[PDB]
Symmetry: D4
Subunit: 205 residues, 8 copies
């Protein structure tokens, strides 16, 4: 399993001249104003991954941000609500062409109440995600092999999941529903950063 | 306050050659698949209102529906999530240019946790909304005077509220946030009709 | 102005109850029929008058009242009859089987509110004010107070008028067969309570 | 264990000239207005099962529906409240002669709080139900071997359970209680379809 | 209404040569190890009361404690579980002949869920208890008239309440039940002092 | 060794003792609905008696003689329940009792787990298997697993009582425990009378 | 009584050559990162108050901030945990000599569970605080008289409350406890700003 | 190596150090009811001292000298409890402390599990077994499992403190932690005084 580990940014975009990129992040926690971005993971879907260690106080990552800014490239996330918030807060660019496998699961896997990435990968791909390293020191100068493998596992399968969810959205005629949810998702992430992270803005109460 | 009561539909659109229309509904309850649309209320903001009784099984209301589908006219609601759902369910047209005073309140009245229409009208306009008729038999062949006046009260003030909320959204620099929420609101209502009425589609769980 | 006839033990006869439907309510020492004895049974023919029958501790028989409860040609009208049916059947050994319940009817028709209590229904449908102050009182007292007697009668004086309106709503929304099935099961729901399932929704998944 | 897989409907009722038939369904989820009927399973109690794939948009299944409508044949379900709702919603016929093993368990297995089919089969029959396929894509064009065997397992044992529950209902003198519950169950299912799925219609609040 | 205010102790027992004495206390709070005894109130049932201010650090009150120790005198409380604990903690003597109107209410007023002294006095005696001074500085050197009248109101009616509750206990044949509860009540208070104040010692969990 | 009986003990030859371990099995937790099915007894000598109670059975004279004997302490685990169903079935409420669950709550202050399985594991290194706790106790013939489970609930209560008595003495809570045990039969009666969901001593 | 309204800052410190100053704030809400400081209120305890309107984006208030950083002047708050957070976030200076009447109430008024400023003023001073304006638009260019009088009422009585609470802390011998709580309070407010506002940092879980 | 003592350390020869790891065992969570049974200490050299405290014991001069020494930082995991029982038993409240649970809540923001077992697993790959946490700590003779568990609670606190200090420096929270540690003894006193169920800083 080829995983390329980088410091600060991708060295170039030679592996990402593609129409969709799988994206994930690791941080010191769930609160972007307190918990810094530590790792950004990328995959083109070819079974390899890039793991980028982000330094404390790092303000720019030009190659990564070019991908995030590129309207011709769909950014694939699992629960992108979080990744979009921490990426936009750290580097100042909010992606606006996105696909989220958790929203897609909630719109299609109506026969289960389990929408986590581990459960999705098990059902749709018979792929086992191990979450032991999800809670680890992601700010460590040197990531362990277990950490690097876990981080890559979050992007290695998102293209395959998106293809299956797209089939399900088409079958149940929910494509326009999903598109509108993905269109609002960057603003849902912005609402979190602005102070509404605990509020369903559409609820009656 | 002039309240014009109609059966089925507006007679014409002479009072609605305007850029924004205040809209509200009354039904037999909170569940559009079970609880039929009984009343639609409209106001141009000039201190008068139209109260339209909708018959059981009524499939058409051409003048009202023309307004709902006119993209040059903003439809103003309080908690439009509901009105949009029952209107789209009954007549087959989902409005797509909307303003919601409840979402606007949640984005601006951060100094309170009370975002109901009565509380908003009291604070912003010193207008007293009486809610006694909210729970009444809206399917009655003849609406009582109290029902008619209550139904009109829900649209008579939405233009004035929208003007104040727009001032607040500009002051706190949240205009683009509100716009994105309003753009998604018709799809939030569609999600309710499709079976996700109890699900925050953007939540982690 | 309201005529309320107070009796000891039983109605003297059924002269006022040669009718197709009778309004029925009870008062007890509490919500648990195995612990809390039946103290009062209230009846109305719908003519604006009521009968209030004091039931003695240990009383086993009330032949005229029980004749009405057993008469399949007379519909017994209750508000939340789930309770009244349980205590009546537990006390006298006869479970009525032709019933109408205004609380079930409200839950099937007043879909625009979440308040289905008798006070709220009477206020909305009839502009009649029910005062609940005596609901929690010593219903086993040898002599009922005037306030207790008036409160007990108020629970049956309006049920015919409520039933008429609810029947209009059930017809309008085409739910008559739904209500009939609920009313047919209601005596068994009360029996389930007496048998030990009072805290269990027998139809729930969990 | 012989499992006969059919498309759309049984070819005939030659295997169902019996007094009681075990019935189960599979769907895309718990909400009949959103989640379509995908599979209907039947067993005569002879250790074999019929698994019928229902097509999207399928409106009729005359042989199956003849069985469901036959008042001389008791339909045995586990938690029939759900199966009755989706069957009636899909084909327009509500069975009215039924036995439910979950209601029967709640009236007899008073020494436990676990009334699921898996737990009942384990205790009463020493039969192991595996539920891994309960949450799976039941709308798949080709059901997997695991899906087919799971679907059959839900009907293969209901006759044997009903026999035991009938013994328990007789021993504890609750036969007329159970009969009244089964008599109301089709209307409980109708109440769900009509909009009362979240309401205990007999509760004080 | 005659209320005699004392410092430290009764001057003598001339008013308490009786079979039953009504007793209440006031403290700085609900936790006897932290919140000192400030007032002890007594009534013979003759419509007068004694209000005894207890000093900080006071170790003895011989006349009061003589009454509390006298096995021929029933001590009447409302929710004596508390008064018994603070009295025993302060003066080292636990009364063992007691009557509690709250336990009596819970065993007889089965037609209500409100067992507070105010509600009991309203129903049984048409007496209005005002609770405004219940939360006040009971350690003040000089109690206000409102405090003194409130403190007296808690003992002025307990004899009359006990008489009525004894009638109800006889009527419903619960006298032996009540007696066993009263016999255990001093140990329930002791359990509170020893560290089980938050534990129902008889509960399964 | 487990002796299985129908209806009652044949005699009291094994129970001329100062304390007897007692347990029951029923069709459920509600004595007015769920009949007494089994009564289990042990003298503490490592053997047990398992008595099947018939539907509608009104008397069990030898068992009831034990329950009535004030010279014999009845040892239970969570006797609040056993006292209720026994008194409801046979009309005699024992009044000299020891409860290992109350004793645990008064002594095992270093844990929040007071079930019999947990107590036996900690104090005796005895493994209680609870699989048969939820089973058809009204069956005409009890299974071997049922009979062994029923006996296991009484085989160890004497040994537990001895340890809890040491702990009650050590922490000086003997009089507290005695008052709780004295009230326990009335706690069971309160349950039968309709207060099963009410802590009668609580403020609310 | 006399309420002096200022724009931006006090004109001078002529009224604040004192040992202790009462301080309160008003904002657009409870979240300092989202909800800006709008008003700062001060009183010397002489029955007069200064109400200072703070502009959006205002970075400096030199006279007010001199008071906040003067170690010889105790800053008196009610629930200073909030005021300290918004003041330190806005002007960059965290006071470190403070007294909080809510903490003081929780350490002394053990006979009640109501520790809000309204309840405290009612009991200790027979002063009626009206809370109607607490939820109002504090960012308004012109505050209403009701707003100004409410804002002043929050500081007019804190000196008198501090005196009484100091008496209670001495009487119950809790002076050193209160001092340690006050010493930690600025760090509790800092912890809120840093991202732990929903965490009791001393709790087991 | 685990040295077991009765009452007190024999001397302070092993504790001429800058920081000492401290833990306790009791009969439960309520210091006014549940007596101190064991005090455990380690210098960080991989050995531990386990001191059995007698019922009614009022003094432990060598232990208390360590607790009083301002030049020696006392390291705890969830010191809020240990500080309360130590101060209540011997009358001395330590005022120079480090708590690994507070440190975890200030640094391990990527998890919601802050127990000692979870910390040791993540930071050290050390497996803490909690089976003996709920045991009779007042036993005259502690079992080997009890002694080893008691020692395991102090054997690793030095290594944990070192790592947490690195994290506190890295995220610039050193002054935050210091203020929390400064208040921690008074948080413990508040528990003893009657506020154990109250967050004194909460709005409600």
């Amino acid at each position: 399993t080829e995983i390329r580990v980088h410091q600060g940014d991708l060295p170039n975009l030679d592996n990402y001249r593609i129409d969709a990129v799988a994206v994930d992040t690791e941080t010191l926690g769930l609160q972007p104003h307190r918990d810094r971005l530590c790792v950004v993971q990328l995959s083109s879907g070819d079974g390899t991954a890039d793991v980028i260690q982000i330094a404390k106080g790092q303000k720019s990552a030009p190659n990564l941000v070019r991908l995030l800014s590129d309207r011709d490239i769909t950014k694939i996330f699992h629960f992108g609500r979080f990744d979009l918030a921490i990426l936009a807060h750290t580097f100042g660019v909010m992606p606006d062409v996105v696909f989220c496998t958790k929203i897609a699961s909630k719109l299609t896997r109506t026969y289960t109440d389990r929408h986590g990435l581990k459960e999705i990968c098990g059902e749709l791909l018979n792929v086992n995600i191990s979450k032991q390293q999800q809670s680890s020191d992601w700010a460590a100068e040197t990531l362990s092999r277990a950490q690097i493998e876990y981080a890559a596992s979050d992007v290695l399968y998102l293209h395959r999941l998106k293809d299956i969810f797209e089939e399900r959205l088409k079958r149940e005629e929910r494509e326009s529903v999903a598109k509108a949810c993905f269109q609002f998702l960057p603003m849902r992430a912005n609402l979190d950063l602005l102070g509404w992270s605990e509020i369903d803005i559409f609820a009656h109460s």
